[PDB]
Design an enzyme around this catalytic site. Structure first.
Site, PDB file in Angstrom:
ATOM      1  N   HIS A   1      -7.158  -4.963  -1.361  1.00 56.18           N
ATOM      2  CA  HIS A   1      -6.280  -4.237  -0.826  1.00 56.18           C
ATOM      3  C   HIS A   1      -5.689  -4.561   0.470  1.00 56.18           C
ATOM      4  O   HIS A   1      -4.685  -5.174   0.756  1.00 56.18           O
ATOM      5  CB  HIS A   1      -6.364  -2.982   0.092  1.00 56.18           C
ATOM      6  CG  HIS A   1      -5.427  -1.709   0.515  1.00 56.18           C
ATOM      7  ND1 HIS A   1      -4.534  -1.365  -1.009  1.00 56.18           N
ATOM      8  CD2 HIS A   1      -5.013  -0.938   0.618  1.00 56.18           C
ATOM      9  CE1 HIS A   1      -3.656  -0.849  -0.398  1.00 56.18           C
ATOM     10  NE2 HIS A   1      -3.801  -0.726   0.207  1.00 56.18           N
TER      11      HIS A   1
ATOM     12  N   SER B   1       0.970  -1.144  -0.036  1.00 51.27           N
ATOM     13  CA  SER B   1      -0.764   0.110  -0.261  1.00 51.27           C
ATOM     14  C   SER B   1       0.687   1.224   0.049  1.00 51.27           C
ATOM     15  O   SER B   1       1.804   1.462  -0.684  1.00 51.27           O
ATOM     16  CB  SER B   1      -0.888  -0.027   0.938  1.00 51.27           C
ATOM     17  OG  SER B   1      -1.748   0.745   1.426  1.00 51.27           O
TER      18      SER B   1
ATOM     19  N   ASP C   1      -9.525  -4.992  -5.246  1.00 50.20           N
ATOM     20  CA  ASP C   1      -8.875  -3.813  -4.380  1.00 50.20           C
ATOM     21  C   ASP C   1      -9.583  -2.775  -5.196  1.00 50.20           C
ATOM     22  O   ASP C   1      -8.540  -1.776  -5.755  1.00 50.20           O
ATOM     23  CB  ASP C   1      -7.091  -3.504  -5.239  1.00 50.20           C
ATOM     24  CG  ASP C   1      -6.892  -2.659  -3.952  1.00 50.20           C
ATOM     25  OD1 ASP C   1      -6.886  -2.524  -3.073  1.00 50.20           O
ATOM     26  OD2 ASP C   1      -5.301  -3.045  -3.700  1.00 50.20           O
TER      27      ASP C   1
END
Ligand SMILES: *[C@@H]1O[C@H](CO)[C@@H](O[C@@H]2O[C@H](CO)[C@@H](O)[C@H](O)[C@H]2NC(C)=O)[C@H](O)[C@H]1NC(C)=O
Ligand SMILES: *[C@@H]1O[C@H](CO)[C@@H](O[C@@H]2O[C@H](CO)[C@@H](O)[C@H](O)[C@H]2NC(C)=O)[C@H](O)[C@H]1NC(C)=O
Ligand SMILES: *[C@@H]1O[C@H](CO)[C@@H](O)[C@H](O)[C@H]1NC(C)=O
Ligand SMILES: *[C@@H]1O[C@H](CO)[C@@H](O)[C@H](O)[C@H]1NC(C)=O
Ligand SMILES: *[C@@H]1O[C@H](CO)[C@@H](O)[C@H](O)[C@H]1NC(C)=O
Ligand SMILES: *[C@@H]1O[C@H](CO)[C@@H](O)[C@H](O)[C@H]1NC(C)=O
Ligand SMILES: *[C@@H]1O[C@H](CO)[C@@H](O)[C@H](O)[C@H]1NC(C)=O
Ligand SMILES: *[C@@H]1O[C@H](CO)[C@@H](O)[C@H](O)[C@H]1NC(C)=O
Lengths: 368, 368
Positions: free
Chosen positions: A342, A142, A313
Site C-alpha cells: 500500500h 488509497s 498490498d
C-alpha cells in the site's frame, strides 16, 4: 533530518520550489488550507493542473516527503505542471469550521462521504476559477481514489472537469484485506466509542494484542508499530529510504476522524461499497433522504481511469482490486506491481520507475 | 497447418506481406541471411526502422509465427514501419562462412559474445546504409536483449543508432533461475563435450532424468518435452494457440551452438554477467587481451530502455530481473505481466494487448 519538524510549506520551499497556500471553504463550512506548487525549482521554471489526493490515515505531505527526484509532486512540477495538493477536513491545516470548533464532536462527525461531497468539489471549483483551466488531471492514492469514485460517479459537473483519473492502490471495497483493519469488525459502535471516542482517531492499544504487531515490534521501531498509518496500511518498509522514516512518522497521520475509521470498519463488515450508516433509519434519512445508506455505483464512474495496484498490498488487496477493474467502464490502463504494498506507491525508492514516470507520460499526451 | 513446412520467406508471403532477403557478412566472415518486411499487407501499404532479435534457442521466425493480428512483426508493418528480422550465426540461413564449413568445429566456436560483437554491428550497418535511416528502434527477446546489453554498452557508435531499446524477458544474469538450464551446472567441460560435442546443440537425453520432464511428458506432447527451446525456456503452453504448436516445433530452435549453451551454463554457475571463458589464461588472452573473461557493465548501457518481464518466467526469473532494473541508467518504463512466462512474450494470444500495443505506441512518439 531537518524536515521532521517542518510544515508542508517549509518542506516544499526547503527544496527550492515555489509554494502557495489557499483557503477553500466547503459548502458545509469547513475551511481547508490547500498548498500549490506552481512550477519546477528550475526545471520548467497557463500550465496544466494536476491535483493530488492522499489516502487513508495519510497526509498531503506524502507527495512531497522525499527527494525532488522521487516525489510525485516535485517531479510533476519539474515536468511543467501546476501541482495542487488536496487537504481533507480534519487533517492538519484543515481543522477549522465556520460553525463549530475542532474541540467539538460535531466537527469530526464525518467520513470520506463528506470529503467527496464537499471538500473535493469546493477545492476544485476554487482551482478551476483561480487558474482559469476548465479541466485538470486527478491523481489519487488509497482512500484518495475512493473519494474520486464517489465524487466522479455522482457529481457530473465535477466529473466533466477531470480528463484522466490516475488511481494508485484503489479502494472501493475492502472485503478481502489482510490488513489489521479487520480486527475492528470485532467491534460494535458501543465499544468503538468507548475505545476511540468521537473526534480524532488514535490506535490506543487496540492493536498490540495482534501477531502482526508483535512481529513488527520485533523487526522495526516501536514508533512505527504504534502509528495508525502503518498499522492499517502495512509496516513493511523494505522499499523505503529508511533514513527518512522519522519524516513520515512526524507527518502521518495528518488527521483522521473516529467516524471515518468506523465507516471503514462498516465496509470491512459488509464487503460492500456504500455511504456511512448513521446509526438508524431516522438518522440516515436526515442525511440521504432514505433509511438505508445508498450504495456507490463504481460503474457509473466514467472518467478515463488508469490503475496501479500492489501485489503485496494488504489494504487494497489484489482480490478486491480484482473485483473492481471489470466494473470500471472506460478503464484505459492497468499495471500490477507484484512487490509493491500500500505505501510503496508513495514512498518506494523506485516509485518513479514503477509508477510516476508512466503518469508523467500518460498526462503529456492528453492535456499538455 | 501449411506453415509447418514453410521457410521464413514463405511464412511471411503466405499472409500477403512483402518479403526481402539480404546477405550480411560479419567482420569475422559469417554470412547471414536477414529478412525484411518493408510494409503492411494493405495496412500502411522513408519509413522508420524496427529491428527484432529472437532469444535463446529460438528463431527469427518467432516474430512471424502466428496470425497477422498477433505477431509483432506483422502488426509493426501494418502500423507503418519497416521491419527487419535479425538472424544470428548458426541458425537457419546463417550457416555459412568465408573461411570454414558448417561441418567444421571452428564454425560453431561462438556464443552470444560474437553475436553482439559481430553479427549485430554488421547487420545494422547494412540496414542503416540500405535505408538511409540514421537511427532505428531495437526490440529484443530473451537472449536478444542480452546481445543488446553487450553491444550497446561497448559499441558507442552502434548505441548511438538505437533510439529506444525494448527488452522482453531481459537476461543479463541467470543466477536464480527455475529453468532446467541449472542442471548443466552439474557438468564440467570434459563431460559437456562428451555429452553434446562441439557444433550444434541437441538435448540428447541429458534432461529425461528430471522431474519437470516427467511432468511435461505426462501433460503435453513428447515432441514438446524433447525440444531444447521448451526444455530451457518452459514447457507451459497455456496462453498459446495450441493449434500452432507444430509450427513452433518445426521452426525452433533455428540453430544454437554447444559453445553458446556452455557460456550460459558458465553464467548459471557464476551468477555473473561476463564474456565466455575460453578455457585458460592463454586462450582468453588470444580473445580479450586479458587472462580473465571481462565482465559486462550493464550500467554502461545508456540507450533508453523499456522492460517487460514475466511473473512465471523460469529463465528470466523475477529475482534476476529484479537485480537488473536498478543497474539500468535511463530505464524509461517497466511492466511485469504476472501470468507470463519466457515464451509468452512471443507466442501468447494476448501478447498484443499485454506488450505489443504499448510498444507500437511507445515507438510512434519518438521516431514516427
Ligand atoms: C535517503 O535519505 C537521505 C536523508 O535525507 C538522503 O541523503 C541526504 O540527502 C540530502 C539531499 O541531497 C543531503 O543534504 C544530505 O547530506 C544527505 N545525507 C544525509 C545523511 O542526510 C539520501 O539521498 C536519500 N536517498 C537515498 C537513495 O539514499
Ligand atoms: C489459432 O490457429 C488456428 C490455425 O492456424 C487459427 O485458425 C485458422 O485461421 C486461419 C486464418 O485466420 C484460417 O485460414 C484457418 O481456416 C483457421 N482454422 C484452421 C483449422 O486452420 C486460429 O484462428 C488461431 N487463433 C485462435 C485464437 O484461434
Ligand atoms: C509553516 O511555518 C511558517 C513559518 O512559521 C508559516 O508562515 C507557514 O504559514 C506554515 N505553514 C502553514 C501551512 O501554516
Ligand atoms: C535520487 O537521488 C539519490 C541520491 O541523491 C539517488 O541515490 C537516487 O537513485 C535518485 N532517485 C532517482 C529516481 O533518480
Ligand atoms: C449503475 O450504473 C450503470 C451505468 O450507468 C447502470 O446501468 C446501473 O443501473 C446503475 N445502478 C446500479 C444500482 O447499478
Ligand atoms: C523459401 O523457399 C523458396 C522456394 O523454395 C526459396 O526461393 C526461398 O529463398 C526460401 N527462403 C529462404 C530464406 O531460403
Ligand atoms: C486475432 O484474430 C482471431 C481470429 O482470426 C481472434 O480470435 C483473436 O482473438 C484475434 N486477436 C487479436 C489480438 O485481435
Ligand atoms: C561501469 O559503468 C559505469 C558507468 O559508465 C562506470 O562509472 C563504472 O566505472 C564502470 N566500470 C565498472 C568496472 O563498473
Amino acid at each position: 533530518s531537518p524536515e521532521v519538524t517542518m510544515n508542508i510549506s517549509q518542506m516544499i520551499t526547503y527544496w527550492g520550489y515555489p509554494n502557495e497556500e489557499y483557503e477553500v471553504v466547503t459548502e458545509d463550512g469547513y475551511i481547508l488550507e490547500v498548498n500549490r506548487i506552481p512550477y519546477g525549482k528550475k526545471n520548467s521554471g497557463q500550465r496544466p493542473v494536476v491535483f493530488l489526493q492522499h489516502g487513508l490515515l495519510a497526509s498531503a505531505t506524502n507527495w512531497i516527503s522525499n527527494l525532488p527526484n522521487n516525489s510525485l509532486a516535485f517531479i510533476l512540477a519539474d515536468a511543467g505542471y501546476d501541482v495542487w495538493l488536496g487537504n481533507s477536513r480534519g487533517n492538519t491545516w484543515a481543522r477549522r469550521n465556520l460553525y463549530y470548533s475542532p474541540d467539538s464532536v460535531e466537527f469530526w462527525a464525518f467520513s470520506f462521504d463528506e470529503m467527496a461531497k464537499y471538500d473535493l468539489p469546493a477545492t476544485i471549483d476554487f482551482i478551476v476559477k483561480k487558474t482559469g483551466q476548465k479541466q485538470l488531471h486527478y491523481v489519487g492514492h488509497s482512500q484518495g481514489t475512493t473519494i474520486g469514485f464517489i465524487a466522479f460517479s455522482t457529481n457530473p459537473s465535477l466529473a466533466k472537469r477531470i480528463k484522466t483519473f490516475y488511481a494508485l492502490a484503489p479502494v472501493a471495497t475492502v472485503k478481502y484485506t489482510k490488513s489489521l483493519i479487520n480486527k475492528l469488525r470485532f467491534v460494535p459502535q458501543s465499544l468503538f466509542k468507548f475505545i476511540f471516542g468521537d473526534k480524532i482517531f488514535y490506535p490506543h492499544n487496540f492493536f498490540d494484542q495482534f501477531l502482526a504487531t508483535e512481529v513488527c515490534s520485533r523487526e522495526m521501531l516501536n514508533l512505527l508499530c504504534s502509528n495508525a498509518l502503518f498499522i492499517i496500511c502495512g509496516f513493511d518498509s523494505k522499499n523505503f529510504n529508511t533514513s527518512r522514516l522519522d519524516v513520515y512518522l512526524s507527518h502521518n497521520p495528518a488527521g483522521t476522524s473516529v467516524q471515518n475509521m468506523f465507516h471503514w470498519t462498516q465496509a470491512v463488515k459488509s464487503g460492500k461499497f456504500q455511504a456511512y450508516d448513521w446509526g438508524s433509519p431516522v438518522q440516515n434519512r436526515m442525511h440521504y433522504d432514505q433509511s438505508q445508506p445508498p450504495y456507490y455505483n463504481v460503474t457509473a464512474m466514467n472518467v478515463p481511469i488508469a490503475v496501479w495496484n500492489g501485489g503485496k498490498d494488504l489494504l487494497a488487496d489484489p482480490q478486491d482490486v480484482g473485483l473492481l477493474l471489470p466494473k470500471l467502464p472506460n478503464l484505459i490502463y492497468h499495471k500490477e506491481i507484484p512487490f509493491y504494498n500500500h505505501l510503496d506507491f508513495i514512498w518506494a525508492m523506485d516509485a518513479p520507475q514503477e509508477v510516476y514516470n508512466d503518469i508523467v507520460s500518460m498526462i503529456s499526451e492528453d492535456k499538455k
